[PDB]
Amino acid sequence: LKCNKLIPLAYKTCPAGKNLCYKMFMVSNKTVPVKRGCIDVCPKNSLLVKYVCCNTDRCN
């Protein structure tokens, strides 16, 4: 898997065990993501922190 980095111009290949890409938002998915990369498990949404995960190259 390849996943976009914080500015999705750049990207990396995920290490072993991380087969999701993610975007992390402060409060709302209608904002500039505040973190991006590879991840093992898609974290649960919380009151102020939202995660969008996906499983294809550079989907984040």
Residue numbers in the entry: 1 to 60
Paper text:
Cobra cytotoxins (CTs) belong to the three-fingered protein family and possess membrane activity. Three-finger toxins (TFTs) are disulfide-rich proteins from the venoms of cobras, kraits, coral, and some other snakes. Cardiotoxins, or cytotoxins (CTs), are one of the largest groups of TFTs, affecting the integrity of lipid membranes, and/or influencing the activity of membrane proteins and the associated signaling cascades. For the first time, a spatial model of CT13Nn with both “water” and “membrane” conformations of the central loop (loop-2) were determined by X-ray crystallography.
Structures of hexagonal (with three molecules in the asymmetric unit denoted A, B, and C) and orthorhombic (with six molecules in an asymmetric unit denoted A, B, C, D, E, and F) crystal forms were solved at 2.3 and 2.6 Å-resolution, respectively. The average value of the B-factor of protein atoms amounts to 38.9 Å2 and 98.5 Å2 in the hexagonal and the orthorhombic form, respectively. This indicates that the hexagonal form is more ordered. Subunit B of the hexagonal form was further used for conformational analysis and comparison with other NMR or X-ray structures. Unusual conformation of the loop-2 in all subunits of the hexagonal and most subunits of the orthorhombic form was similar to that found by NMR for cytotoxin 1 from N. oxiana (5NQ4) in DPC micelle. For the first time, in this work the structure similar to the membrane-bound conformation of functionally important loop-2 of an S-type CT was observed in the two crystal forms. Apparently, these conformational changes are caused by the repulsion of loop-2 from its neighbor molecules in the crystal cell.
